[PDB]
Amino acid sequence: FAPIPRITWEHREVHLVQFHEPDIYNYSALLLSEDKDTLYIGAREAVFAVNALNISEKQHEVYWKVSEDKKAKCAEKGKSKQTECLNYIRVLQPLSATSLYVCGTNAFQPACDHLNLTSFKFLGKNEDGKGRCPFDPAHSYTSVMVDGELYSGTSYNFLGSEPIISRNSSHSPLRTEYAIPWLNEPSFVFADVIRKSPGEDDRVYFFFTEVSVEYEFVFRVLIPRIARVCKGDQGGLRTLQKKWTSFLKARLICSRPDSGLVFNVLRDVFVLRSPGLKVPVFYALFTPQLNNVGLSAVCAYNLSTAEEVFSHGKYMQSTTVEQSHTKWVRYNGPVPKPRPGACIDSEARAANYTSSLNLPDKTLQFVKDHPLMDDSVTPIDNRPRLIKKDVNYTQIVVDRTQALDGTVYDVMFVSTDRGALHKAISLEHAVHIIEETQLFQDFEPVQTLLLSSKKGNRFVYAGSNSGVVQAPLAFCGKHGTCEDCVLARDPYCAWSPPTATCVALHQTESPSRGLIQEMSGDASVCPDKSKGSYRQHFFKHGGTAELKCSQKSNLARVFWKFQNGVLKAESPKYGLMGRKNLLIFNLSEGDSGVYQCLSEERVKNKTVFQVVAKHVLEVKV
Amino acid sequence: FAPIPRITWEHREVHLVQFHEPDIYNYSALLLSEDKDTLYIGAREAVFAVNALNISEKQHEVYWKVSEDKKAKCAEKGKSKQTECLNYIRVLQPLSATSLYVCGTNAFQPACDHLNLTSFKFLGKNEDGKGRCPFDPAHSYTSVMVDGELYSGTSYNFLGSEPIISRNSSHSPLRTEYAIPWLNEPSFVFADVIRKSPGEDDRVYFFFTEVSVEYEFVFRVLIPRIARVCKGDQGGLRTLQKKWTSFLKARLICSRPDSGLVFNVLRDVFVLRSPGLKVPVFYALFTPQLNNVGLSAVCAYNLSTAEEVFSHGKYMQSTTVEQSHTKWVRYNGPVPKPRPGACIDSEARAANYTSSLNLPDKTLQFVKDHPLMDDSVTPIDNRPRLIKKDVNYTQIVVDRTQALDGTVYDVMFVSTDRGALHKAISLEHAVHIIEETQLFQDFEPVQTLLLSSKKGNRFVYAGSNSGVVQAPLAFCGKHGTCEDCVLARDPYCAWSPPTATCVALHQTESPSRGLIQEMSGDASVCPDKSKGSYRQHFFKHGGTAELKCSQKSNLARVFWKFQNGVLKAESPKYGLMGRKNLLIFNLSEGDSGVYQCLSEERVKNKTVFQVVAKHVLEVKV
Questions:
Q1: Is the Cβ–Cβ distance between B451 and B397 less than 8 Å?
Q2: A398 to chain B nearest CA, in Å?
Q3: How big is the A-B interface in CB pairs under 8 Å?
Q4: Are residues A596 and A574 in the same domain?
């Protein structure tokens, strides 16, 4: 299991910009403008536009509240008139340069509109949102705007049942079959397009947790799924009419068998796209369904691993489906030539199959009956990237950054259900949790996370029920000396001797080749050896002394030394107010002397020692 | 989840009698004399007889070490000569008033002998213990002597690859089939007889955890089982020759579906009989196989619940789905003439079947292929009696006692893998862990737990690798005041006004109707509440004094009061020395007076206060 965060920043010690609007709650949707200078925030009954560099600066705001009349009809349906019968923004996507596509629960009457960015006024289309936005604010949903087409995953009705993954377009509107083999009580998590290159079609991936049809246990077992459809899908001609002919799904496994750890509940997914790396990586956040005392895990998957399963793996087959009971097993028979679930490609095309509409019924009937793959999509290295006890993580974003020495790091930012944010990097041999910051002082769970993209200073935006918080990717300035800046082992921070400050790389002006940084934690490379704080004390004989000492690291052991020896602070001679401060009770002349508060922190190969504080004590009389 | 132990007794504050022999280890088998007040202990290479009233007092001792010859012959087999190639006693059972049946691993060469109690010397019978005793001291095992016949559950061979439950009698020795459907890599936990009326046969029940064949998951899932055979079984004539004809098993479930908690690994079972109980109760201890960060649970089962399943439940059926892959489903077909797996009772006698040897082959073939029941044996109330976090419980014994007001409590004594004992009860829809005692100072896991049968002063004996410990059912004498005594909410303890002491309700000569006990924890009625701890303080001016405050409640919030009003141990004038003690810095004079230390505790719906310490100090000017 990962260690505890090395440093804990109280909301206080650090600078965090916050945004919220009196009497407006549930800031669950965030979207950066195309120019990246503005951040759009979808909340309950409102949408705001704020400076992406300082979200406390509100630029625009618009409301879309439910009429008292409509709120009346909604309460009649037996819903909370003060919580449920409101318009919770659920879709907030880019439509064009001048507008956004916005959908809200509209008091259990899903509706969509266009937000004119120029006037920042809703156009008032009030389109039906059934199928693209849920009815209930508690229901799960996901969606992704792909070439002007909204691909959605959510519940089709008021009860939250009738799960549906559909693309509603003017031309080819497709959807999933209302059948357990396709979707079995799924909880939607994420959806994104994997296009890149190339005549290769683009695929839209959907991620969710659903009840497994292939696993049996004491009670219903949940299982995470990675699924995808082809953007160019057109539905079948006689079969799968107006339904996907490319829908395939597979298990997404995050576990540690030797430990009997199984994280079968998917919480979030992030697609890491790197200009320098040819294949995107899916970072996924899981929690266990069984005996969850508070465990969380992060697994990373190579897209090519997922692609090989859908393109070359075996399908599962429902052998016997009735009272003898439906059993799902590996299908060993022959597979229809145009591979079921495949996107129309060179071969398919080089055989007259130009669109899904002319695919053979054999191929179409097969896919309609075998949407589940037999193989599991496994993580990179076949193990989780991070497993953490005593924390319920809710979201994850990953930033690829280069340390001073060129080494590239995939820094994971994961929030918690208590409003905090952990920053971690895998440091080959273990996971290093650089720090944790309390984003929300009310301890509201973090519901959504978003990395800033503008060229320049980088930030993370976190949304919760009480507001949005903007945080920098690092607090380098918080480290007052080279040893500390170096011991943080934070790829974003380096020491700048000329300025005598721990600086944030890439964006900094400091001595490029003169900056210091050691991802090994070997502060021995620093120029000076800070000797901590120095202070003289003059106390009244008999009285009691209290010597202050404290440091930021949670992984360092601090102790006192006096006259070349380690002080044993117990009683009634000593105290220890704050498990750091030394207390000396019967102040007699024997207590006169030099007291040192040292710290020992085991880093990579070597352990580092530091003088935190030095006190010269003189008891008078 | 249950709370933490309310009171914590150090190994030294309470008095525990201990027994151990120099150089003798692994005290895993305990047996109480049928008549005499003697406790027989089987360790590695030895068997002792000690005073059950004071186990540290040895009465007899006989040894059975393996010669250096076989020691090497065994070490020649790839086993460790100084630890594995020794004679671990595994069976210690009563044979007759003057004899004990004893079996030991005997350097990977199971052997059984008689122990003449009179002379307390072995008869050198050297019977082959293959099947009745394991080869490896690390292999699971269990057994019970029934009418002079040993029913054993363990491994049949050197490697422990072949599991077996058998009765190797002189006339009708029976064993289980060496087949997956019967036993699938089981780990044996417990075995006991359930005597039956008038005519009905006695059943011998077996408890073990095995790899489930009916469940399919990410990886192999374990499942606890309760199984039984009929004592009168004689095997089949032309089918199941020399094999049980009454072997049936079923899943033993301990879970709380509401929070996704499932404890599928069985650790121990205890049968609660008590004269005021027409039907025994099975208390079982479980831990989870999945995501186990240290979770334990106790579930109680009604014997009649299991009987219903075995006599009226549907069987499961193996189905060779596809090819080479078998799945287990519920069987709905017709069930053979006399019920497969039933004992020879009335319906069979009435059909002229007087022995398993007369059962129709159709019935015998069915039971051979259908040993698994389709229904689960579920706990009383369908939920655990206790679920505890951060603890790994190893053994359990239960004592049914009656409080002073007549209320009956099933007190659960559960040991931990760190050598401690917890005493817990079900109190007003919640679990109350009365206390925790460190039985073994070496923190050795408690391997076996035994509860002595009511005979005035009762005890619990715990055996570990390092020795055997004896503890009373309560430490009533450790509660100094009536308030302490009542607050403990221990059904064994009551306050004796006449003697001004907390006494064991059932061993005191103090008039019972005068005794004070309130399981609600309300100590209002207690006499002389001006507790006890009272201190006088002569303190110099400008000095610094620590005011000691002691209370045993791990659940209490203690605070201080000053001249009527509740003080705030807040700097710069105060400071509590690590939760408890109040320090008064710079002994001024307005600081002179009486200091009260109150302990606040929630005892039901009520919040109560107890003056834990009274301090009267005057700083001399």
A1: yes
A2: 26
A3: 101
A4: yes
